[PDB]
Amino acid sequence: SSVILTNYMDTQYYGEIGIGTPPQTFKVVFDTGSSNVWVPSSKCSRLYTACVYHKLFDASDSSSYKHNGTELTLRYSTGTVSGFLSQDIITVGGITVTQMFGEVTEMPALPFMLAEFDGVVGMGFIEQAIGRVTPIFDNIISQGVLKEDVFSFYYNRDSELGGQIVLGGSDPQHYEGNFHYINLIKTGVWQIQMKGVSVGSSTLLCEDGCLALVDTGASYISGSTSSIEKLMEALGAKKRLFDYVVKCNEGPTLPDISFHLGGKEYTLTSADYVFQESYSSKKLCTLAIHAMDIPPPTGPTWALGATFIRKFYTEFDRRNNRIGFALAR
16 A cells, blocks of 8 residues: 655655544654654644644544543654544555544644644654554554555655655665665664764764664754764854755755665765755755754664655565665656
């Protein structure tokens, strides 16, 4: 089964899922960095403008709904949501599964007023599921329909499909060459060992080794504040409140950035990490690489998001606990 994704500004990739009977439609980001499912709730006070601007799940309109009500809070790197647990049928790419999810009643305007999507579908492991709720992919596997215990991600460029998720396999139509796998450092987290990060002609980063969270929910490639300081200083980039910019005219002159994973060099060109909105030296162009300190036990860690995925088709193998990369097509 495949899920078609919409690409919004190269920063938000989302697909649609159906919840309840009759189905209530929601736009959601599929995030390998988290393990819970949540959508805005009809029970969210309208004083939360984000809720006024998003699809709200209404339990009183679903004959398949099953009450639970256990309170829960989901804390992401850029924001927090809170609400309670509910159970209902969810349709994903044609597949129907009974799932426990969060009905969010507290959704901060910043950052949610800026979210094109309504909610999130955690594709992570149960180990990191808040409230220990069984993850949707685990619930799908338990059905015994998928030919393989794996899911794949394809994120296209902004274009004028925005992307695609394949449940139970991969789509040869979106990658070339063959996959190269890196075993997970530990089950329960889609994090792999990274052997080094080179900027141009000087592998001055992640010397001695470091961690890499393969995060489909992260818009950018991220690293600790220290690491990014060195990387950016090397690029001649100036820091701002929530990102780094470079004068547009020099964007194309920026050096390649390579990530050493599993004995393979995954290389990105400046065209791959710079939002080349123009070539004026009188304008600032943002870079799709940010500083992000991810707390323990997962972090400190680098995070490989959309910026990386766009270039490399990614397969998440639950059966062999590893991740495979291939040149996106």
